[PDB]
Structure formats: structure tokens, C-alpha cells
Design an enzyme around this catalytic site. Structure first.
Site, PDB file in Angstrom:
ATOM      1  N   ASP A 185      25.794 -11.168   4.010  1.00  0.00           N
ATOM      2  CA  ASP A 185      24.892 -11.180   5.146  1.00  0.00           C
ATOM      3  C   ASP A 185      25.018 -12.510   5.909  1.00  0.00           C
ATOM      4  OD1 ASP A 185      23.567 -11.636   2.458  1.00  0.00           O
ATOM      5  OD2 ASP A 185      22.097 -12.597   3.775  1.00  0.00           O
ATOM      6  N   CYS A 219      24.222  -1.740   7.619  1.00  0.00           N
ATOM      7  CA  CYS A 219      24.411  -2.912   6.801  1.00  0.00           C
ATOM      8  C   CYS A 219      23.034  -3.071   6.187  1.00  0.00           C
ATOM      9  CB  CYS A 219      24.843  -4.149   7.638  1.00  0.00           C
ATOM     10  SG  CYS A 219      24.070  -4.445   9.207  1.00  0.00           S
ATOM     11  N   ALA A 221      20.127  -4.872   7.851  1.00  0.00           N
ATOM     12  CA  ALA A 221      19.171  -4.711   8.922  1.00  0.00           C
ATOM     13  C   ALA A 221      19.732  -3.765   9.974  1.00  0.00           C
ATOM     14  CB  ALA A 221      18.826  -6.080   9.546  1.00  0.00           C
ATOM     15  N   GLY A 222      21.050  -3.553   9.932  1.00  0.00           N
ATOM     16  CA  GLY A 222      21.689  -2.674  10.894  1.00  0.00           C
ATOM     17  C   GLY A 222      22.004  -3.326  12.234  1.00  0.00           C
ATOM     18  N   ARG A 225      26.304  -7.238  10.807  1.00  0.00           N
ATOM     19  CA  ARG A 225      27.573  -6.649  10.406  1.00  0.00           C
ATOM     20  C   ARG A 225      27.852  -5.330  11.159  1.00  0.00           C
ATOM     21  NH1 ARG A 225      25.800  -7.718   4.259  1.00  0.00           N
ATOM     22  NH2 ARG A 225      23.789  -7.455   5.339  1.00  0.00           N
ATOM     23  N   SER A 226      26.843  -4.475  11.277  1.00  0.00           N
ATOM     24  CA  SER A 226      27.018  -3.200  11.970  1.00  0.00           C
ATOM     25  C   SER A 226      27.453  -3.440  13.427  1.00  0.00           C
ATOM     26  CB  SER A 226      25.713  -2.405  11.948  1.00  0.00           C
ATOM     27  OG  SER A 226      25.344  -2.019  10.629  1.00  0.00           O
ATOM     28  N   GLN A 266      24.921 -11.216  14.614  1.00  0.00           N
ATOM     29  CA  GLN A 266      23.965 -12.265  14.311  1.00  0.00           C
ATOM     30  C   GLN A 266      24.349 -13.725  14.214  1.00  0.00           C
ATOM     31  OE1 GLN A 266      20.177 -12.125  13.447  1.00  0.00           O
ATOM     32  NE2 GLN A 266      20.709 -10.951  15.272  1.00  0.00           N
TER      33      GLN A 266
HETATM   34  C1  600 Z   1      15.103  -6.978  22.420  1.00  0.00           C
HETATM   35  O1  600 Z   1      14.552  -7.941  23.022  1.00  0.00           O
HETATM   36  C2  600 Z   1      14.038  -8.953  22.405  1.00  0.00           C
HETATM   37  C3  600 Z   1      12.605  -9.430  22.680  1.00  0.00           C
HETATM   38  C4  600 Z   1      11.426 -10.318  22.498  1.00  0.00           C
HETATM   39  C5  600 Z   1      11.479 -11.836  22.606  1.00  0.00           C
HETATM   40  C6  600 Z   1      10.345  -9.770  23.445  1.00  0.00           C
HETATM   41  C7  600 Z   1      14.017  -9.095  20.993  1.00  0.00           C
HETATM   42  C8  600 Z   1      13.061  -8.418  20.119  1.00  0.00           C
HETATM   43  C9  600 Z   1      13.173  -8.638  18.706  1.00  0.00           C
HETATM   44  C10 600 Z   1      14.201  -9.497  18.145  1.00  0.00           C
HETATM   45  C11 600 Z   1      14.360  -9.748  16.714  1.00  0.00           C
HETATM   46  C12 600 Z   1      15.435 -10.630  16.268  1.00  0.00           C
HETATM   47  C13 600 Z   1      15.642 -10.930  14.747  1.00  0.00           C
HETATM   48  C14 600 Z   1      14.484 -11.008  13.887  1.00  0.00           C
HETATM   49  C15 600 Z   1      14.609 -11.287  12.498  1.00  0.00           C
HETATM   50  C16 600 Z   1      15.911 -11.504  11.912  1.00  0.00           C
HETATM   51  C17 600 Z   1      16.004 -11.801  10.345  1.00  0.00           C
HETATM   52  C18 600 Z   1      15.307 -10.931   9.224  1.00  0.00           C
HETATM   53  C19 600 Z   1      16.034  -9.496   9.267  1.00  0.00           C
HETATM   54  C20 600 Z   1      17.569  -9.395   9.142  1.00  0.00           C
HETATM   55  C21 600 Z   1      18.202  -9.379   7.830  1.00  0.00           C
HETATM   56  C22 600 Z   1      19.628  -9.306   7.703  1.00  0.00           C
HETATM   57  C23 600 Z   1      20.456  -9.247   8.902  1.00  0.00           C
HETATM   58  C24 600 Z   1      21.946  -9.216   8.838  1.00  0.00           C
HETATM   59  F1  600 Z   1      22.422  -9.940   9.871  1.00  0.00           F
HETATM   60  F2  600 Z   1      22.357  -9.782   7.683  1.00  0.00           F
HETATM   61  P1  600 Z   1      22.642  -7.511   8.934  1.00  0.00           P
HETATM   62  O2  600 Z   1      24.160  -7.710   8.895  1.00  0.00           O
HETATM   63  O3  600 Z   1      22.123  -6.766   7.776  1.00  0.00           O
HETATM   64  O4  600 Z   1      22.193  -6.832  10.243  1.00  0.00           O
HETATM   65  C25 600 Z   1      19.827  -9.259  10.191  1.00  0.00           C
HETATM   66  C26 600 Z   1      18.431  -9.329  10.305  1.00  0.00           C
HETATM   67  C27 600 Z   1      15.650 -11.533   7.784  1.00  0.00           C
HETATM   68  C28 600 Z   1      16.574 -12.663   7.603  1.00  0.00           C
HETATM   69  C29 600 Z   1      16.900 -13.175   6.303  1.00  0.00           C
HETATM   70  C30 600 Z   1      16.309 -12.586   5.147  1.00  0.00           C
HETATM   71  C31 600 Z   1      15.390 -11.493   5.279  1.00  0.00           C
HETATM   72  C32 600 Z   1      15.065 -10.966   6.563  1.00  0.00           C
HETATM   73  N1  600 Z   1      13.819 -10.831   9.411  1.00  0.00           N
HETATM   74  N2  600 Z   1      13.330  -9.656   9.913  1.00  0.00           N
HETATM   75  N3  600 Z   1      12.015  -9.917   9.942  1.00  0.00           N
HETATM   76  C33 600 Z   1      11.584 -11.124   9.517  1.00  0.00           C
HETATM   77  C34 600 Z   1      10.343 -11.729   9.404  1.00  0.00           C
HETATM   78  C35 600 Z   1      10.252 -13.066   8.896  1.00  0.00           C
HETATM   79  C36 600 Z   1      11.436 -13.785   8.508  1.00  0.00           C
HETATM   80  C37 600 Z   1      12.722 -13.155   8.627  1.00  0.00           C
HETATM   81  C38 600 Z   1      12.816 -11.819   9.136  1.00  0.00           C
HETATM   82  C39 600 Z   1      17.059 -11.425  12.773  1.00  0.00           C
HETATM   83  C40 600 Z   1      16.928 -11.145  14.154  1.00  0.00           C
HETATM   84  C41 600 Z   1      16.321 -11.239  17.217  1.00  0.00           C
HETATM   85  C42 600 Z   1      16.194 -11.019  18.613  1.00  0.00           C
HETATM   86  P2  600 Z   1      17.372 -11.860  19.708  1.00  0.00           P
HETATM   87  O5  600 Z   1      18.667 -12.117  18.949  1.00  0.00           O
HETATM   88  O6  600 Z   1      17.690 -10.931  20.906  1.00  0.00           O
HETATM   89  O7  600 Z   1      16.836 -13.140  20.150  1.00  0.00           O
HETATM   90  C43 600 Z   1      15.146 -10.151  19.095  1.00  0.00           C
HETATM   91  N4  600 Z   1      14.980  -9.901  20.455  1.00  0.00           N
END
Ligand code: 600
Ligand code: MG
Length: 289
Positions: A185, A219, A221-222, A225-226, A266
């Protein structure tokens, strides 16, 4: 033509100026922002693996059921490339049924798994498929039965043959399962070569053909990697489908894709990797045999 000599040197330039982060960050802050009202309803809290990662309402996959039609999954449609993919999170203990229901209803023939059931001393994904031929799985809630038929385990990935049976309509379909097992990840594949090989294996299986439903990619979170996998695939098509391959703007394509699901790709490194994979892959696919 040795037109790739530029793409390669351009890539070398970005590498020389170390501007991958800036490029990546510029894309994040220009990405589409759409509602995820359904994803956030209280009754669906337990159907989401992560709190801040949700499918947009407009492109979410809907389960054909009157009870609750929700699943954290998104349909990504790429016009020019002429390819569709469904991106979803690693199934949860309580959503494996929903997962296979989606595969059935959307008529998918293949499933691409890019994470592992046990990641960093913490199972970041449920075992949603049978590990033994003799221990098939039955999902009471969706009335589906799943059976492992055969599996070819290789070094960087495993390919499995599964049989999905809708116990209601009594039909049976063969679902191919492509698992890439060495992609951490927030990390990158072992190498472009192993990545591309895996990609080509998926392509030649016909699982991405228009005669079937879209392939389901996931993957944990989808999105990281996806998204990297789908971006690479889509850009490879455009380079082979356009007069001038160098006219393929990966940044532009990622933005297009980010209209269907948030946070695709990511880390800056994953962006660089997708870039390198697309260049290496195009040279192969365009190279003599
Ligand atoms: C769509 O529009 C926008 C809008 C708003 C600002 C309005 C919008 C709206 C929501 C958004 C959210 C996240 C965005 C939000 C959270 C995360 C990390 C994650 C989930 C996650 C896990 C693994 C993978 C991976 F990469 F490994 P994989 O390969 O499996 O996919 C990707 C994502 C998390 C990280 C680490 C361990 C456990 C959970 N997580 N999830 N919830 C959490 C709560 C507290 C702490 C960590 C948290 C990433 C992106 C990021 C963005 P951004 O990149 O665009 O900035 C966003 N943008
Ligand atoms: Mg056995």
C-alpha cells in the site's frame, strides 16, 4: 519511429528536475469534486472500509436489490480509450456477498486484485474467495455460491479460475481472478516489467473485452493501486490508438478518470511509475516481434 526518444528524455527531465511531486499535487487540487451522499448515509456506514474514501453518487455501482442498493464501487468510463472498469474497495467481512452480487449483475468476467489479505501485520481485506477447491463459499444473503476451480501461482502474481453460481437463476459463469501479490500500500510494483506482464496477462484473457461486463479492479481502498493500474491500461490504449503517441497527456487522462472516483493514484511515485510503465509498454507493443 524513435519518437519515444523524446518521451524518454522528457521523463528524464522531470526526473532531473525532481518535479513529480509538483505535477502530482497539481492534479490532486484540480480534480473533480462530486457528491457522495449515498455513501455517507448512516445505514451504509458499515459498508465502507474507510471513512474518507467514497464513491461519487453519479458513478456508484448499484446492487439490484430493494433492501439496500449500496456498495463502495465506481464505474469508470473512458470515451476515447473505449474501455470501462469498475473500481471498488477490498471486500469487508459483511460485503463479500454484495461484491459477488455486483460481479454477477454487471456481468464481469474478471477480477483484478492488487493488494493482499494480510498487509503490514493487519488484514486489510477479507478472504472473499475460496482457497481450497473442496471448500467452496456460499453467500446466503445474495444467494450465490463460489468455487475455486484451479490456480496458477507465480512469483509476482497468481491467476485463478473460479466458478460463480447464482442459486436463484441456477446459471453458472467462469470468473477469472488476477491477483498481483507484491504491491505494497502506498507503494509501487516490483518493477514495470512484472507489472506490464501482469497487465498483458489480464488483457489476453479477454476479461477486458466489450462483449463482457467491465472488469472489477480493487486494492484496499480502491484508489491508489487500482487507479495506477487503470491509468496505465487506458494510456497504453490511447498511445496505440492515436496517430501521435506523444500526444497522450497522462495528467489529463488521470483527471478524466478522477471524475468517476476520487483519489486515483495516491503518491507521486505511483504517478511516475504509471508513466514509466506506459512508456516501456508502448515500446514493446509498438516494437517488432
Ligand atoms: C473528490 O473531491 C474531493 C473533496 C473535498 C475536499 C470536498 C475529495 C473528497 C474526499 C477525499 C479523500 C481522500 C483520502 C482520504 C483518506 C486516505 C487514507 C485512508 C484510506 C486509504 C487506505 C489505503 C489506500 C491505498 F492507497 F493504499 P489503495 O492502493 O488501497 O487505494 C488509499 C486510501 C487510510 C490510510 C492509511 C491507513 C488506513 C486508512 N483513510 N481513509 N479514511 C481515514 C480516516 C482517518 C485516517 C486515515 C484514513 C486517502 C485519501 C483524498 C482526496 P484528494 O486526493 O482529492 O485530495 C479527497 N478529495
Ligand atoms: Mg488441494
Amino acid at each position: 519511429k524513435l519518437e519515444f526518444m523524446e518521451m524518454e528524455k522528457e521523463f528524464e527531465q522531470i526526473d532531473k528536475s525532481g518535479s513529480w511531486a509538483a505535477i502530482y499535487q497539481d492534479i490532486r487540487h484540480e480534480a473533480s469534486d462530486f457528491p457522495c451522499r449515498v455513501a455517507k448515509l448512516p445505514k451504509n456506514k458499515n459498508r465502507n472500509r474507510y471513512r474518507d474514501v467514497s464513491p461519487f453518487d453519479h458513478s456508484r455501482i448499484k446492487l439490484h436489490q430493494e433492501d439496500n442498493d449500496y456498495i463502495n464501487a465506481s464505474l469508470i468510463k473512458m470515451e476515447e480509450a473505449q474501455r470501462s472498469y469498475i473500481l471498488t474497495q477490498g471486500p469487508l467481512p459483511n460485503t463479500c456477498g454484495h461484491f459477488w452480487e455486483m460481479v454477477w449483475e454487471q456481468k464481469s468476467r474478471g477480477v483484478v486484485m492488487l493488494n493482499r489479505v494480510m498487509e503490514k501485520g493487519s488484514l486489510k481485506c477479507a478472504q472473499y474467495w475460496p482457497q481450497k477447491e473442496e471448500k467452496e463459499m456460499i453467500f446466503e444473503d445474495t444467494n450465490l455460491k463460489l468455487t475455486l476451480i484451479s490456480e496458477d501461482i507465480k512469483s509476482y502474481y497468481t491467476v485463478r479460475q473460479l466458478e460463480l453460481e447464482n442459486l436463484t437463476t441456477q446459471e453458472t459463469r467462469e470468473i477469472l481472478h488476477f491477483h498481483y501479490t507484491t504491491w505494497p500500500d502506498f507503494g509501487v510494483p516490483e518493477s514495470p516489467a512484472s507489472f506490464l506482464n501482469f497487465l498483458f496477462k489480464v488483457r489476453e484473457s479477454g476479461s477486458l473485452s466489450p462483449e463482457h461486463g467491465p472488469v472489477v479492479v480493487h486494492c484496499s481502498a480502491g484508489i491508489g493501486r487500482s487507479g495506477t493500474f487503470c491509468l496505465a491500461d487506458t494510456c497504453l490504449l490511447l498511445m496505440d490508438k492515436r496517430k501521435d503517441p506523444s500526444s497522450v497527456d497522462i495528467k489529463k487522462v488521470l483527471l478524466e478518470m478522477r471524475k468517476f472516483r476520487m483519489g486515483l493514484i495516491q503518491t507521486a511515485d505511483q504517478l511516475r511509475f504509471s508513466y514509466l510503465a506506459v512508456i516501456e509498454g508502448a515500446k514493446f507493443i509498438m516494437g517488432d516481434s
